[PDB]
Ligand binder design. Structure first.
Ligand code: HEM
Length: 446
């Protein structure tokens, strides 16, 4: 059964701190690094168990993950059973129709050996912990780059940079989570390596870990806002209200979190806020043909692309349980400054902001990589639709820098196509393995 005492907390619970830092490092002098990995890091790595109880939530929550080259730097030559991980994300970039030539140079290679995730309610507390780490490891650890992140302020807390409530939908792990209405229920082995029904044999020390897919995804917020206003469908309501409808059609939820499948023409903030109701849908509606009806939610909507529910078969009434093996746990958090007055006024981005995207899964080919390549970037996914050309995911869909053709967004005519510029720009990332806690002071320090 699932030993959550040994699983790093960000995988199944999330850090849920106001501030987060992703500290990307290289390893020098591995013998020294190992001594301090065991003495300074292992004892303060936060587990799922620790983070699940308010009384044992640490002032500073810390998780750590290693790239393939990081594991090799530690002398670990075992096959973790994931080719995508082994090759690194840079080599996978072409799978998503982007080029590493546009990436942050540090990501465009395999020099990064790991990431330390620090999380606390102030940046000062994070900085203290970083200083402590640098002090004790000394030059055996080398900071290559970092990314600071934060829960957004005020009423936007929990929302991402475009303004949409985030973190609503996660797979429920059978035997661990108490499933919510509409929530998918999956074997632990979909997310945790070596757990129930993970078909891939793993090294013994790796049982209880997960692969971490990190993506630095810049969001062009003023451009997005202006696009919605310019293309707002006609109707009663303010221009902004109509623009909001278009945005909700693109995401699959209103900014409040209310799923459009359950409220297609108007927002419902109370619904959005209620975990017992805001996920209780399958995309099926009696009296409507699933293959052609986009009046409730477009086939191209972001959440419909990333969790198709009834589009891939299964129960038409909640909960739909299709494609469990293609589930990911998300622990993303926004980064960069809020949109400034001048940027909003000019409808133009000057400073970089976006999502520090984090997905956990036991198989990269089934999770993040599949959702990006086979769904989001695929004009003919989901399958079996009429028209067959769904178009691309308007939020994350990519086609080598070109505007994306996205169909079904306009309620007045499902055959109407929009050509949408990219609102999300990849600056690259890396694939890591978050080991079980026992491996940190154990195998990895040996
Ligand atoms: C800046 C980029 C992104 C933004 C702004 C964004 C935004 C959102 C929002 C607002 C939601 C709805 C809230 C929720 O259901 O929890 C969502 C859901 C989701 N997103 Fe994204 N996301 C981004 C990147 C990605 C990427 C790259 C992937 C995978 C390749 C992804 C996969 C998912 C999944 C699996 C869900 C939940 C779907 C469900 O269970 O119904 N997201 N995202």
């Amino acid at each position: 059964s699932l030993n959550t005492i040994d699983i790093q907390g960000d995988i199944l619970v999330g850090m849920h701190k106001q501030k987060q830092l992703f500290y990307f490092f290289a390893i020098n002098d591995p013998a020294t690094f190992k001594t301090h990995l065991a003495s300074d890091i292992a004892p303060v790595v936060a587990s799922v168990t620790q983070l699940s109880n308010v009384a044992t939530q640490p002032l500073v929550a810390l998780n750590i993950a290693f790239s393939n080259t990081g594991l090799l730097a530690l002398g670990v030559t075992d096959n973790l059973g994931d080719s995508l991980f082994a090759n690194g994300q840079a080599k996978d970039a072409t799978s998503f129709k982007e080029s590493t030539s546009s990436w942050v140079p540090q990501f465009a290679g395999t020099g990064i050996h790991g990431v330390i995730i620090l999380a606390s309610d102030t940046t000062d507390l994070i900085d203290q912990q970083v200083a402590s780490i640098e002090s004790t490891f000394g030059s055996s650890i080398s900071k290559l780059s970092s990314l600071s992140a934060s829960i957004r302020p005020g009423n936007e807390a929990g929302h991402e940079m475009f303004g949409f409530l985030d973190g609503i939908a996660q797979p429920a792990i059978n035997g661990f989570n108490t499933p919510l209405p509409g929530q998918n229920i999956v074997d632990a082995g979909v997310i945790i390596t070596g757990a129930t029904n993970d078909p891939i044999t793993r090294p013994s020390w790796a049982v209880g870990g997960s692969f971490l897919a990190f993506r630095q995804l810049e969001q062009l917020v003023p451009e997005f806002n202006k696009y919605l206003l310019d293309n707002a469908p006609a109707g009663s309501g303010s221009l902004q209200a109509r623009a909001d409808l278009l945005g909700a059609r693109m995401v699959g939820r209103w900014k409040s979190g209310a799923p459009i499948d359950l409220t297609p023409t108007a927002d419902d903030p109370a619904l959005g806020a209620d975990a017992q109701r805001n996920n209780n849908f399958t995309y099926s509606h009696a009296g409507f043909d699933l293959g052609s009806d986009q009046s409730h939610c477009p086939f191209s909507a972001h959440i419909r692309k990333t969790r198709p529910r009834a589009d891939l078969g299964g129960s038409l009434t909640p909960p739909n349980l299709s494609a469990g093996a293609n589930s990911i746990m998300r622990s993303g958090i926004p980064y960069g400054p809020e949109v400034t007055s001048a940027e909003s006024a000019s409808n133009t981005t000057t400073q970089e902001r976006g999502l520090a995207f984090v997905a956990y899964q036991a198989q990269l080919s089934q999770g993040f990589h599949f959702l990006q390549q086979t769904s989001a970037d695929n004009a003919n996914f989901p399958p079996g639709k009429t028209p067959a050309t769904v178009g691309l995911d308007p939020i994350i869909g990519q086609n080598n820098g070109q505007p994306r053709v996205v169909n079904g967004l306009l309620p007045s005519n499902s055959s109407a196509s929009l050509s949408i510029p990219q609102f999300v720009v990849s600056h690259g990332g890396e694939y890591f393995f978050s080991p079980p806690i026992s491996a940190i002071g154990g195998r990895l320090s040996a």
